[PDB]
Amino acid sequence: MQLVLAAKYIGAGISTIGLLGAGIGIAIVFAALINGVSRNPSIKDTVFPMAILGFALSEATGLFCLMVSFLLLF
Amino acid sequence: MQLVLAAKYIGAGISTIGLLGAGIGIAIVFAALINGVSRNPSIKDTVFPMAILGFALSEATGLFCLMVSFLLLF
Amino acid sequence: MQLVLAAKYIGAGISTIGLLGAGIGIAIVFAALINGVSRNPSIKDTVFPMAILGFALSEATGLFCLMVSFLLLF
Amino acid sequence: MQLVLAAKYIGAGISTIGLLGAGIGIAIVFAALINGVSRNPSIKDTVFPMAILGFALSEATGLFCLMVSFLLLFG
Amino acid sequence: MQLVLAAKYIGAGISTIGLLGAGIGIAIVFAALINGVSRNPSIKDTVFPMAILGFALSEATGLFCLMVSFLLLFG
Amino acid sequence: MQLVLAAKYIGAGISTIGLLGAGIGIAIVFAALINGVSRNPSIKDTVFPMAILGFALSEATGLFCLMVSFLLLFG
Amino acid sequence: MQLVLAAKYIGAGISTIGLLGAGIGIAIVFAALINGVSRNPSIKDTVFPMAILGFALSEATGLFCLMVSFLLLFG
Amino acid sequence: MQLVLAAKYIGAGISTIGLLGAGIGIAIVFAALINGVSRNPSIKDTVFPMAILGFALSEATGLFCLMVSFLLLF
Amino acid sequence: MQLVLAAKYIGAGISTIGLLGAGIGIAIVFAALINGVSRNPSIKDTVFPMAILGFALSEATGLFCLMVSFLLLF
Amino acid sequence: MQLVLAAKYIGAGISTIGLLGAGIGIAIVFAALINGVSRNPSIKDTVFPMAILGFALSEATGLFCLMVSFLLLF
Ligand SMILES: *N(C(=O)NC1CCCCC1)C1CCCCC1
Ligand SMILES: *N(C(=O)NC1CCCCC1)C1CCCCC1
Ligand SMILES: *N(C(=O)NC1CCCCC1)C1CCCCC1
Ligand SMILES: *N(C(=O)NC1CCCCC1)C1CCCCC1
Ligand SMILES: *N(C(=O)NC1CCCCC1)C1CCCCC1
Ligand SMILES: *N(C(=O)NC1CCCCC1)C1CCCCC1
Ligand SMILES: *N(C(=O)NC1CCCCC1)C1CCCCC1
Ligand SMILES: *N(C(=O)NC1CCCCC1)C1CCCCC1
Ligand SMILES: *N(C(=O)NC1CCCCC1)C1CCCCC1
Ligand SMILES: *N(C(=O)NC1CCCCC1)C1CCCCC1
C-alpha cells in the first residue's frame, strides 16, 4: 500500500496545478468588468451579472481540480 | 497491481491540468462579452448567445479532461 | 505487463494536457467574434462562418490529443 | 514509509505551482483598476470595491493550493 | 522490452503537449481575420488567403508533434 | 532518511516555480501604473497607492511559495 | 540498454514540447500581417515579405526541436 | 549521500525555472516605460523612477529563486 | 555508464523546451515591425534594424538551449 | 557516482527552461521600442537607451540560468 499511498499524495499535488486557470480566469472577468464600467458607467447593472456568471463558470473548473485533489488525499 | 493503481492515481491528477484551459478560455469569452456590451449596449441580445456557444465549446474541452480523470480514478 | 499498463495510464493523463490549447483557442476565436460584431454589427453574417471555421480547426488539435488518450486507455 | 514521506514533500512543493495563478490574477485586477481610474477618475468609488471582490475571489484559488500544500506538509 | 514499451507510451503522451501551440496559434490567426474584416470589410478577399496560409503553417507544427506521437505508438 | 532528504530538496526547488507568478504580476501592476500616469499625469497620487496595494497582494503569493521552500530546506 | 532506449524515447517526446513556440509564433506574425493590411491595405507588398521572414525565423526554432527529436528516435 | 547529492543538483536546476518570471516581468515594465514616454515625452522624469521600482520588485522574485538554487548547489 | 547515458538523452530533450522562448519572441518582434510599418510606412528604414537586433538577441537564448542540448547528445 | 553525474546532466537540461523568459522578455522590450518609434519618431534617441537597459536586465536573468547550467555540466 506504500506505493499506492505515495501516488495518492503526488497526484493530489499535481491536481492543484489546474487552479491557476481559475485564478487567472476570474481576474480576466473582473478586469473586463472594471474596464467596461470605467468606459461606460451607465452599463454597470447590465454587465455586473455577466461578470458573476463568468466568474462562476471559470471558478467551476478550479472547484473540480480541488475535488480530484481531495479524493486523492482522502 | 500496486504499480497499476499508483499509475491510475498519478494519471488522474495529471489529467486535471488541461482544465486550466477551460478556466481561462471561458473567462476570455466573458471578458469579450462585457467589453462588447459596454462599447455597444444595443448589441447585447445578439452577442449573448455567441458567448453561451463560445463558453460551451471551450468548456467541452475541460469536460473531457475530467472524463479521463474520472475513468482513471474509478 | 504491469509496468506497460502503468505507462499507458500515465501517458493517457499526459495526453490531455494539450487540450488546454483548444480550450483557450476556441475562446480566442469567440472573443474576436463578439468584439467584431459589437464594433460592426452589420458584419455578423460574414464573420460568423469565419469563427466556425476557426473553432473547428482549433478543436481539431484537441480532438487528436483525446484520440491519443483513448488509444492509450484502450 | 520512506516512500510515503518522500511523496508528501514532493507533493507539497508541486502544490505551490498553482499560486502563480493568483499572483498573476491579482495583478490583472489591479492593472484594470489603475487603467480604469486613469481614464475616468470619477469612477474610482464604483470600481474600487469591484477590484477588492475580484482580488478576493482570485486569491481564494491561491489559498486552496496552499491548504493542500499545508495538509501534505503537516497532516 | 517492458521498460522500452513503457517509455514509448509515456513518450507518445508527452509528444501531444506541443499540440497546444497549434490549438492557440490557429485561433490567434482567426481572431486577427475576424477583427480585420470587422474593421475593414472591403479587405476580406485579401486577408482571407493570408489567414489560410497562417493557419496551415501553424498547424504544420502540430502535425509533426502528432507524427512523433504515432511513431512511438505504432513504430 | 536518504530518500526523505532527497525529496525535501526536490520539493524545495519545485516550490520556487510559483514565484514566476509574482515576478510577472508585479510587473503587470507597474506597467498599468506607468501607462495610466503617462495618459493622465494628474491621477498619479490616486493610482500610486493602488499600485502599492496590487504589488503587495501579488507578492504575498510568492512569499508563501518561498515559505514552503524554506520549510522543506530548513524544517 | 533497456534504460538507454527508454530514455531515447522519453527524450524524443519531451523534445517536441518546444514546437508549441513556433506554432504560436508563426500565428503571431500572421495575425500582425492581417491586422496591418486591414488597417492600411496599400502596405501589403511591403509587409508580406517581412511576414515571410518572421515566419521563417520562428519556424527554424521548431525545426531544431524536431531535429533533436529525430536524432533521439533514429540515431 | 549519493542520492541526496543527486537531489540537490536536480533541485538546483528546477529552482531556476522561476527566473522566467523576472525575465518576462522586467521586460513588461520596460515596455510600458518606452510606450509611456513615446506617447507623452514630458512624463519621462515621473515614470522612469516608477519603472526602476517596478524592475527592482520583479527582480527580487528572480533573486530568491537563485538564492534557493545556490543553497542547493552549495 | 547506462544511467549516465540515459540522463544525457533525457537532459538533451528537456533542453529544447527553452526554444519555445525564441519561437515566440522572434514572432513578437516581427509582429511589432509589421504593425509599426503599417501605421507609419515612412519609418520602415528606422525600425527594420531594430527588429533585426531584437530578433538576434531573442534568438541567442534559443541558440544556447540548443548548445546544451548538443553537448548532452554528443 | 553514476547517480550524481546523471543528476548533473538532467539538472543542466532543466536549468535552460528559464531561458524562455529572456527569449520572450527581450522581444517584448524590442516590440515596445519599434511601436514607440513608429508612433513618435522624434523620441528615438530617448527610448533607445531605455530598450538597451531593459534588454540587459531581462537578459541577466537568462544569463544566470545558463551559469547554473554550465556549473552542473562542468
Ligand atoms: N472557487 C469557488 O468555489 N469560489 C466560491 C467563493 C465564494 C463565492 C462563491 C464561489 C474556488 C475554487 C477553488 C477553491 C477555492 C474556491
Ligand atoms: N464545464 C461545464 O461542464 N460547465 C457546465 C456548467 C453549468 C452549465 C452547463 C455547463 C466544466 C468542465 C470541467 C468541470 C466543471 C464544469
Ligand atoms: N472538439 C470536438 O472535437 N468537437 C466536435 C465533437 C463532435 C461533433 C462536432 C464537434 C472537442 C475536443 C475535446 C472533447 C470535446 C470536443
Ligand atoms: N491570499 C489569501 O488567501 N489572502 C487572505 C489571507 C487571510 C486574510 C484574508 C486574505 C494569498 C493566498 C496565498 C498565500 C498568501 C495569501
Ligand atoms: N493539423 C493538420 O496537420 N492538418 C492537416 C491534416 C492532413 C490533411 C491536411 C490538414 C492538425 C494537427 C493536429 C491534429 C489534427 C490536424
Ligand atoms: N515579496 C515579498 O514577500 N516581499 C516582502 C518580504 C518581507 C518584507 C516585506 C516585503 C517577494 C516574494 C519573493 C521573494 C522576495 C520577496
Ligand atoms: N517549420 C519548418 O521547418 N518548415 C520548413 C520545412 C522545410 C521547407 C521549408 C519550411 C516546421 C517545423 C516543425 C515541423 C513542420 C515544419
Ligand atoms: N536581479 C537582480 O538581483 N539584480 C541585482 C543584482 C545585484 C545589483 C542590483 C541588481 C537578477 C536576478 C537573477 C540574476 C541576475 C540579477
Ligand atoms: N536561431 C538562429 O540562430 N537563427 C539564425 C538563422 C539564420 C539567420 C541568422 C540567425 C535559431 C536558434 C535555434 C536553432 C535554429 C536557429
Ligand atoms: N544574454 C546575453 O548575455 N546577451 C548578450 C548579447 C550580446 C551583448 C551583451 C549581452 C543571453 C543569456 C543566455 C545565453 C545567450 C545570451
PDB file of N, CA, C and O in Angstrom, chain A residues 3-4 7 11 14-15 18 21 25 28-29 32-33 36 39-40 43 46-47 50-51 53-54 57-58 61 64-65 68 71-72, chain B residues 2-3 5-6 9-10 13-14 16-17 19-20 22-24 26-27 30-31 33-35 37-39 41 44 55 66 69 73:
ATOM      1  N   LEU A   3       3.327   2.238  -2.126  1.00  0.00           N
ATOM      2  CA  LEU A   3       3.430   2.809  -3.464  1.00  0.00           C
ATOM      3  C   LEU A   3       2.143   3.532  -3.866  1.00  0.00           C
ATOM      4  O   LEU A   3       2.185   4.625  -4.437  1.00  0.00           O
ATOM      5  N   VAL A   4       1.005   2.917  -3.556  1.00  0.00           N
ATOM      6  CA  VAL A   4      -0.308   3.475  -3.886  1.00  0.00           C
ATOM      7  C   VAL A   4      -0.576   4.757  -3.091  1.00  0.00           C
ATOM      8  O   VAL A   4      -1.101   5.743  -3.635  1.00  0.00           O
ATOM      9  N   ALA A   7       1.548   7.619  -4.403  1.00  0.00           N
ATOM     10  CA  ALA A   7       0.939   8.098  -5.635  1.00  0.00           C
ATOM     11  C   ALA A   7      -0.276   8.993  -5.356  1.00  0.00           C
ATOM     12  O   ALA A   7      -0.506   9.979  -6.068  1.00  0.00           O
ATOM     13  N   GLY A  11      -0.220  12.701  -6.817  1.00  0.00           N
ATOM     14  CA  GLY A  11      -1.437  13.024  -7.561  1.00  0.00           C
ATOM     15  C   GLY A  11      -2.209  14.220  -7.024  1.00  0.00           C
ATOM     16  O   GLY A  11      -2.613  15.090  -7.797  1.00  0.00           O
ATOM     17  N   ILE A  14      -0.303  17.402  -7.859  1.00  0.00           N
ATOM     18  CA  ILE A  14      -0.430  17.667  -9.286  1.00  0.00           C
ATOM     19  C   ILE A  14      -1.797  18.281  -9.609  1.00  0.00           C
ATOM     20  O   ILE A  14      -1.885  19.218 -10.413  1.00  0.00           O
ATOM     21  N   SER A  15      -2.835  17.803  -8.922  1.00  0.00           N
ATOM     22  CA  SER A  15      -4.203  18.214  -9.227  1.00  0.00           C
ATOM     23  C   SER A  15      -4.505  19.676  -8.890  1.00  0.00           C
ATOM     24  O   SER A  15      -5.485  20.231  -9.398  1.00  0.00           O
ATOM     25  N   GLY A  18      -4.079  22.928 -12.009  1.00  0.00           N
ATOM     26  CA  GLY A  18      -5.198  23.480 -12.766  1.00  0.00           C
ATOM     27  C   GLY A  18      -5.945  24.653 -12.145  1.00  0.00           C
ATOM     28  O   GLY A  18      -6.637  25.398 -12.860  1.00  0.00           O
ATOM     29  N   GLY A  21      -5.746  28.221 -13.566  1.00  0.00           N
ATOM     30  CA  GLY A  21      -6.696  28.573 -14.629  1.00  0.00           C
ATOM     31  C   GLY A  21      -7.826  29.440 -14.103  1.00  0.00           C
ATOM     32  O   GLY A  21      -8.171  30.462 -14.711  1.00  0.00           O
ATOM     33  N   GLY A  25      -8.414  33.218 -14.750  1.00  0.00           N
ATOM     34  CA  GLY A  25      -9.675  33.433 -15.470  1.00  0.00           C
ATOM     35  C   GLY A  25     -10.579  34.389 -14.715  1.00  0.00           C
ATOM     36  O   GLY A  25     -11.137  35.308 -15.297  1.00  0.00           O
ATOM     37  N   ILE A  28      -9.453  37.899 -15.215  1.00  0.00           N
ATOM     38  CA  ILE A  28      -9.728  38.396 -16.566  1.00  0.00           C
ATOM     39  C   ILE A  28     -11.179  38.909 -16.662  1.00  0.00           C
ATOM     40  O   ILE A  28     -11.448  39.927 -17.303  1.00  0.00           O
ATOM     41  N   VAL A  29     -12.102  38.200 -16.012  1.00  0.00           N
ATOM     42  CA  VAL A  29     -13.516  38.602 -15.988  1.00  0.00           C
ATOM     43  C   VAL A  29     -13.674  39.924 -15.256  1.00  0.00           C
ATOM     44  O   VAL A  29     -14.320  40.846 -15.756  1.00  0.00           O
ATOM     45  N   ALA A  32     -12.340  42.932 -17.098  1.00  0.00           N
ATOM     46  CA  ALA A  32     -13.231  43.407 -18.163  1.00  0.00           C
ATOM     47  C   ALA A  32     -14.370  44.244 -17.570  1.00  0.00           C
ATOM     48  O   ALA A  32     -14.749  45.297 -18.117  1.00  0.00           O
ATOM     49  N   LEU A  33     -14.913  43.767 -16.449  1.00  0.00           N
ATOM     50  CA  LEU A  33     -15.944  44.488 -15.711  1.00  0.00           C
ATOM     51  C   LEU A  33     -15.475  45.899 -15.375  1.00  0.00           C
ATOM     52  O   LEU A  33     -16.177  46.887 -15.645  1.00  0.00           O
ATOM     53  N   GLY A  36     -14.983  47.921 -18.531  1.00  0.00           N
ATOM     54  CA  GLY A  36     -16.288  48.234 -19.124  1.00  0.00           C
ATOM     55  C   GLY A  36     -17.055  49.308 -18.386  1.00  0.00           C
ATOM     56  O   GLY A  36     -17.629  50.213 -18.999  1.00  0.00           O
ATOM     57  N   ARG A  39     -15.339  52.829 -18.896  1.00  0.00           N
ATOM     58  CA  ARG A  39     -15.662  53.406 -20.206  1.00  0.00           C
ATOM     59  C   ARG A  39     -17.119  53.815 -20.356  1.00  0.00           C
ATOM     60  O   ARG A  39     -17.427  54.732 -21.096  1.00  0.00           O
ATOM     61  N   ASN A  40     -18.021  53.100 -19.695  1.00  0.00           N
ATOM     62  CA  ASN A  40     -19.452  53.391 -19.818  1.00  0.00           C
ATOM     63  C   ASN A  40     -20.116  53.123 -18.475  1.00  0.00           C
ATOM     64  O   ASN A  40     -20.699  52.053 -18.276  1.00  0.00           O
ATOM     65  N   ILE A  43     -23.605  51.329 -17.893  1.00  0.00           N
ATOM     66  CA  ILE A  43     -23.793  49.899 -18.239  1.00  0.00           C
ATOM     67  C   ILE A  43     -23.594  48.930 -17.047  1.00  0.00           C
ATOM     68  O   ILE A  43     -23.787  47.714 -17.184  1.00  0.00           O
ATOM     69  N   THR A  46     -26.068  46.132 -16.124  1.00  0.00           N
ATOM     70  CA  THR A  46     -26.138  45.161 -17.207  1.00  0.00           C
ATOM     71  C   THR A  46     -24.963  44.174 -17.168  1.00  0.00           C
ATOM     72  O   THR A  46     -25.175  42.973 -17.337  1.00  0.00           O
ATOM     73  N   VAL A  47     -23.746  44.668 -16.937  1.00  0.00           N
ATOM     74  CA  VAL A  47     -22.557  43.808 -17.098  1.00  0.00           C
ATOM     75  C   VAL A  47     -22.148  43.099 -15.798  1.00  0.00           C
ATOM     76  O   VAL A  47     -21.459  42.081 -15.846  1.00  0.00           O
ATOM     77  N   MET A  50     -23.252  39.528 -15.832  1.00  0.00           N
ATOM     78  CA  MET A  50     -22.409  38.805 -16.784  1.00  0.00           C
ATOM     79  C   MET A  50     -21.064  38.439 -16.167  1.00  0.00           C
ATOM     80  O   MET A  50     -20.531  37.356 -16.426  1.00  0.00           O
ATOM     81  N   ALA A  51     -20.508  39.356 -15.376  1.00  0.00           N
ATOM     82  CA  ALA A  51     -19.260  39.111 -14.667  1.00  0.00           C
ATOM     83  C   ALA A  51     -19.445  37.997 -13.627  1.00  0.00           C
ATOM     84  O   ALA A  51     -18.580  37.139 -13.470  1.00  0.00           O
ATOM     85  N   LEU A  53     -21.674  35.497 -13.671  1.00  0.00           N
ATOM     86  CA  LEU A  53     -21.786  34.259 -14.431  1.00  0.00           C
ATOM     87  C   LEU A  53     -20.410  33.795 -14.928  1.00  0.00           C
ATOM     88  O   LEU A  53     -20.047  32.629 -14.758  1.00  0.00           O
ATOM     89  N   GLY A  54     -19.652  34.726 -15.519  1.00  0.00           N
ATOM     90  CA  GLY A  54     -18.285  34.465 -15.974  1.00  0.00           C
ATOM     91  C   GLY A  54     -17.406  33.913 -14.870  1.00  0.00           C
ATOM     92  O   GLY A  54     -16.735  32.892 -15.060  1.00  0.00           O
ATOM     93  N   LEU A  57     -18.520  30.251 -13.784  1.00  0.00           N
ATOM     94  CA  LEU A  57     -18.178  29.233 -14.779  1.00  0.00           C
ATOM     95  C   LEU A  57     -16.668  28.959 -14.840  1.00  0.00           C
ATOM     96  O   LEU A  57     -16.255  27.804 -14.954  1.00  0.00           O
ATOM     97  N   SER A  58     -15.855  30.015 -14.742  1.00  0.00           N
ATOM     98  CA  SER A  58     -14.402  29.864 -14.624  1.00  0.00           C
ATOM     99  C   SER A  58     -14.005  29.174 -13.306  1.00  0.00           C
ATOM    100  O   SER A  58     -13.141  28.295 -13.284  1.00  0.00           O
ATOM    101  N   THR A  61     -14.214  25.204 -12.908  1.00  0.00           N
ATOM    102  CA  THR A  61     -13.079  24.402 -13.348  1.00  0.00           C
ATOM    103  C   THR A  61     -12.069  24.210 -12.210  1.00  0.00           C
ATOM    104  O   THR A  61     -11.533  23.114 -12.036  1.00  0.00           O
ATOM    105  N   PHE A  64     -13.438  21.697  -9.494  1.00  0.00           N
ATOM    106  CA  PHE A  64     -13.246  20.295  -9.857  1.00  0.00           C
ATOM    107  C   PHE A  64     -11.812  19.785  -9.738  1.00  0.00           C
ATOM    108  O   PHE A  64     -11.593  18.615  -9.420  1.00  0.00           O
ATOM    109  N   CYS A  65     -10.838  20.663  -9.972  1.00  0.00           N
ATOM    110  CA  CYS A  65      -9.447  20.336  -9.685  1.00  0.00           C
ATOM    111  C   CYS A  65      -9.273  19.999  -8.209  1.00  0.00           C
ATOM    112  O   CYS A  65      -8.607  19.015  -7.860  1.00  0.00           O
ATOM    113  N   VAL A  68     -10.858  16.470  -7.163  1.00  0.00           N
ATOM    114  CA  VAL A  68      -9.928  15.383  -7.506  1.00  0.00           C
ATOM    115  C   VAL A  68      -8.776  15.335  -6.504  1.00  0.00           C
ATOM    116  O   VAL A  68      -8.368  14.253  -6.055  1.00  0.00           O
ATOM    117  N   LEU A  71     -10.229  13.886  -3.233  1.00  0.00           N
ATOM    118  CA  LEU A  71     -10.493  12.461  -3.414  1.00  0.00           C
ATOM    119  C   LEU A  71      -9.198  11.689  -3.208  1.00  0.00           C
ATOM    120  O   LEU A  71      -9.185  10.662  -2.531  1.00  0.00           O
ATOM    121  N   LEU A  72      -8.108  12.206  -3.775  1.00  0.00           N
ATOM    122  CA  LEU A  72      -6.803  11.566  -3.647  1.00  0.00           C
ATOM    123  C   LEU A  72      -6.234  11.646  -2.221  1.00  0.00           C
ATOM    124  O   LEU A  72      -5.692  10.653  -1.715  1.00  0.00           O
TER     125      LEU A  72
ATOM    126  N   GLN B   2      -0.183  -3.059  -7.565  1.00  0.00           N
ATOM    127  CA  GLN B   2       0.115  -1.837  -6.811  1.00  0.00           C
ATOM    128  C   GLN B   2       0.669  -0.743  -7.727  1.00  0.00           C
ATOM    129  O   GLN B   2       0.402   0.446  -7.524  1.00  0.00           O
ATOM    130  N   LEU B   3       1.428  -1.161  -8.738  1.00  0.00           N
ATOM    131  CA  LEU B   3       2.050  -0.255  -9.700  1.00  0.00           C
ATOM    132  C   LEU B   3       1.020   0.348 -10.666  1.00  0.00           C
ATOM    133  O   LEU B   3       1.111   1.526 -11.025  1.00  0.00           O
ATOM    134  N   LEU B   5      -2.317   0.699  -9.962  1.00  0.00           N
ATOM    135  CA  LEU B   5      -3.184   1.601  -9.197  1.00  0.00           C
ATOM    136  C   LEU B   5      -2.486   2.940  -8.940  1.00  0.00           C
ATOM    137  O   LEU B   5      -3.107   4.003  -9.036  1.00  0.00           O
ATOM    138  N   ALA B   6      -1.194   2.871  -8.623  1.00  0.00           N
ATOM    139  CA  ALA B   6      -0.330   4.049  -8.495  1.00  0.00           C
ATOM    140  C   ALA B   6      -0.423   4.929  -9.733  1.00  0.00           C
ATOM    141  O   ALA B   6      -0.601   6.144  -9.634  1.00  0.00           O
ATOM    142  N   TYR B   9      -3.720   6.804 -10.205  1.00  0.00           N
ATOM    143  CA  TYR B   9      -3.856   7.946  -9.322  1.00  0.00           C
ATOM    144  C   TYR B   9      -3.025   9.137  -9.788  1.00  0.00           C
ATOM    145  O   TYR B   9      -3.516  10.264  -9.789  1.00  0.00           O
ATOM    146  N   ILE B  10      -1.784   8.884 -10.203  1.00  0.00           N
ATOM    147  CA  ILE B  10      -0.923   9.942 -10.730  1.00  0.00           C
ATOM    148  C   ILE B  10      -1.511  10.479 -12.040  1.00  0.00           C
ATOM    149  O   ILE B  10      -1.660  11.693 -12.210  1.00  0.00           O
ATOM    150  N   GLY B  13      -4.492  12.804 -11.534  1.00  0.00           N
ATOM    151  CA  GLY B  13      -4.001  14.140 -11.190  1.00  0.00           C
ATOM    152  C   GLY B  13      -3.501  14.922 -12.395  1.00  0.00           C
ATOM    153  O   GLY B  13      -3.846  16.096 -12.572  1.00  0.00           O
ATOM    154  N   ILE B  14      -2.673  14.281 -13.213  1.00  0.00           N
ATOM    155  CA  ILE B  14      -2.121  14.924 -14.401  1.00  0.00           C
ATOM    156  C   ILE B  14      -3.243  15.379 -15.348  1.00  0.00           C
ATOM    157  O   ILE B  14      -3.159  16.446 -15.958  1.00  0.00           O
ATOM    158  N   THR B  16      -6.065  16.672 -14.832  1.00  0.00           N
ATOM    159  CA  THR B  16      -6.804  17.882 -14.458  1.00  0.00           C
ATOM    160  C   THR B  16      -6.082  19.180 -14.879  1.00  0.00           C
ATOM    161  O   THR B  16      -6.676  20.256 -14.868  1.00  0.00           O
ATOM    162  N   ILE B  17      -4.808  19.074 -15.258  1.00  0.00           N
ATOM    163  CA  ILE B  17      -4.032  20.231 -15.720  1.00  0.00           C
ATOM    164  C   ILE B  17      -4.735  20.938 -16.881  1.00  0.00           C
ATOM    165  O   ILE B  17      -4.896  22.163 -16.857  1.00  0.00           O
ATOM    166  N   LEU B  19      -7.641  21.420 -17.508  1.00  0.00           N
ATOM    167  CA  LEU B  19      -8.775  22.220 -17.042  1.00  0.00           C
ATOM    168  C   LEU B  19      -8.441  23.702 -16.939  1.00  0.00           C
ATOM    169  O   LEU B  19      -9.337  24.548 -16.999  1.00  0.00           O
ATOM    170  N   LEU B  20      -7.160  24.021 -16.772  1.00  0.00           N
ATOM    171  CA  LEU B  20      -6.742  25.416 -16.771  1.00  0.00           C
ATOM    172  C   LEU B  20      -7.162  26.116 -18.084  1.00  0.00           C
ATOM    173  O   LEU B  20      -7.491  27.314 -18.077  1.00  0.00           O
ATOM    174  N   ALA B  22      -9.964  25.522 -20.032  1.00  0.00           N
ATOM    175  CA  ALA B  22     -11.341  25.984 -19.864  1.00  0.00           C
ATOM    176  C   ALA B  22     -11.439  27.156 -18.866  1.00  0.00           C
ATOM    177  O   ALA B  22     -12.158  28.125 -19.113  1.00  0.00           O
ATOM    178  N   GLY B  23     -10.734  27.065 -17.739  1.00  0.00           N
ATOM    179  CA  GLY B  23     -10.761  28.138 -16.733  1.00  0.00           C
ATOM    180  C   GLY B  23     -10.474  29.495 -17.364  1.00  0.00           C
ATOM    181  O   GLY B  23     -11.212  30.472 -17.161  1.00  0.00           O
ATOM    182  N   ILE B  24      -9.409  29.547 -18.152  1.00  0.00           N
ATOM    183  CA  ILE B  24      -9.012  30.779 -18.817  1.00  0.00           C
ATOM    184  C   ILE B  24      -9.902  31.059 -20.040  1.00  0.00           C
ATOM    185  O   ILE B  24     -10.347  32.187 -20.240  1.00  0.00           O
ATOM    186  N   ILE B  26     -13.024  30.203 -20.896  1.00  0.00           N
ATOM    187  CA  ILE B  26     -14.358  30.704 -20.505  1.00  0.00           C
ATOM    188  C   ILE B  26     -14.305  32.180 -20.089  1.00  0.00           C
ATOM    189  O   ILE B  26     -15.162  32.980 -20.483  1.00  0.00           O
ATOM    190  N   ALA B  27     -13.304  32.533 -19.290  1.00  0.00           N
ATOM    191  CA  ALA B  27     -13.117  33.924 -18.879  1.00  0.00           C
ATOM    192  C   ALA B  27     -12.868  34.880 -20.046  1.00  0.00           C
ATOM    193  O   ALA B  27     -13.388  35.986 -20.045  1.00  0.00           O
ATOM    194  N   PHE B  30     -16.241  35.581 -21.722  1.00  0.00           N
ATOM    195  CA  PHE B  30     -16.986  36.540 -20.905  1.00  0.00           C
ATOM    196  C   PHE B  30     -16.403  37.971 -20.863  1.00  0.00           C
ATOM    197  O   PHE B  30     -17.157  38.945 -20.826  1.00  0.00           O
ATOM    198  N   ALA B  31     -15.079  38.088 -20.871  1.00  0.00           N
ATOM    199  CA  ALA B  31     -14.415  39.396 -20.961  1.00  0.00           C
ATOM    200  C   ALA B  31     -14.782  40.126 -22.256  1.00  0.00           C
ATOM    201  O   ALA B  31     -15.067  41.333 -22.245  1.00  0.00           O
ATOM    202  N   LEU B  33     -17.552  39.549 -23.993  1.00  0.00           N
ATOM    203  CA  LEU B  33     -18.950  39.874 -23.871  1.00  0.00           C
ATOM    204  C   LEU B  33     -19.114  41.198 -23.124  1.00  0.00           C
ATOM    205  O   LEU B  33     -19.828  42.083 -23.590  1.00  0.00           O
ATOM    206  N   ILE B  34     -18.464  41.317 -21.973  1.00  0.00           N
ATOM    207  CA  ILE B  34     -18.561  42.515 -21.151  1.00  0.00           C
ATOM    208  C   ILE B  34     -18.061  43.755 -21.919  1.00  0.00           C
ATOM    209  O   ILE B  34     -18.715  44.804 -21.910  1.00  0.00           O
ATOM    210  N   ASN B  35     -16.923  43.603 -22.595  1.00  0.00           N
ATOM    211  CA  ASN B  35     -16.347  44.729 -23.301  1.00  0.00           C
ATOM    212  C   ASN B  35     -17.166  45.093 -24.543  1.00  0.00           C
ATOM    213  O   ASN B  35     -17.302  46.276 -24.857  1.00  0.00           O
ATOM    214  N   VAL B  37     -20.519  44.664 -24.897  1.00  0.00           N
ATOM    215  CA  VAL B  37     -21.749  45.263 -24.425  1.00  0.00           C
ATOM    216  C   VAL B  37     -21.521  46.668 -23.840  1.00  0.00           C
ATOM    217  O   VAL B  37     -22.362  47.558 -24.013  1.00  0.00           O
ATOM    218  N   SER B  38     -20.385  46.882 -23.172  1.00  0.00           N
ATOM    219  CA  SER B  38     -20.054  48.211 -22.670  1.00  0.00           C
ATOM    220  C   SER B  38     -19.861  49.225 -23.807  1.00  0.00           C
ATOM    221  O   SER B  38     -20.279  50.387 -23.701  1.00  0.00           O
ATOM    222  N   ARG B  39     -19.208  48.793 -24.879  1.00  0.00           N
ATOM    223  CA  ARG B  39     -18.982  49.673 -26.031  1.00  0.00           C
ATOM    224  C   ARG B  39     -20.232  49.859 -26.883  1.00  0.00           C
ATOM    225  O   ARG B  39     -20.412  50.897 -27.492  1.00  0.00           O
ATOM    226  N   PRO B  41     -24.097  48.888 -26.088  1.00  0.00           N
ATOM    227  CA  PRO B  41     -25.168  48.199 -25.327  1.00  0.00           C
ATOM    228  C   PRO B  41     -26.291  47.589 -26.176  1.00  0.00           C
ATOM    229  O   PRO B  41     -26.854  46.558 -25.781  1.00  0.00           O
ATOM    230  N   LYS B  44     -26.382  43.627 -27.166  1.00  0.00           N
ATOM    231  CA  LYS B  44     -26.441  42.609 -26.107  1.00  0.00           C
ATOM    232  C   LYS B  44     -27.149  41.299 -26.533  1.00  0.00           C
ATOM    233  O   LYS B  44     -26.606  40.207 -26.331  1.00  0.00           O
ATOM    234  N   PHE B  55     -18.636  29.724 -24.639  1.00  0.00           N
ATOM    235  CA  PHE B  55     -18.439  29.090 -23.336  1.00  0.00           C
ATOM    236  C   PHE B  55     -18.570  27.572 -23.446  1.00  0.00           C
ATOM    237  O   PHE B  55     -17.706  26.836 -22.967  1.00  0.00           O
ATOM    238  N   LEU B  66     -11.766  15.972 -17.662  1.00  0.00           N
ATOM    239  CA  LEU B  66     -12.379  15.467 -16.443  1.00  0.00           C
ATOM    240  C   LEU B  66     -12.933  14.038 -16.596  1.00  0.00           C
ATOM    241  O   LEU B  66     -12.954  13.280 -15.621  1.00  0.00           O
ATOM    242  N   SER B  69      -9.876  11.883 -16.251  1.00  0.00           N
ATOM    243  CA  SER B  69      -9.610  11.868 -14.813  1.00  0.00           C
ATOM    244  C   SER B  69     -10.460  10.823 -14.078  1.00  0.00           C
ATOM    245  O   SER B  69      -9.925   9.948 -13.406  1.00  0.00           O
ATOM    246  N   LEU B  73      -9.601   7.344 -12.033  1.00  0.00           N
ATOM    247  CA  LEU B  73      -9.947   7.208 -10.614  1.00  0.00           C
ATOM    248  C   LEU B  73     -10.809   5.977 -10.329  1.00  0.00           C
ATOM    249  O   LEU B  73     -10.596   5.290  -9.332  1.00  0.00           O
TER     250      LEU B  73
END
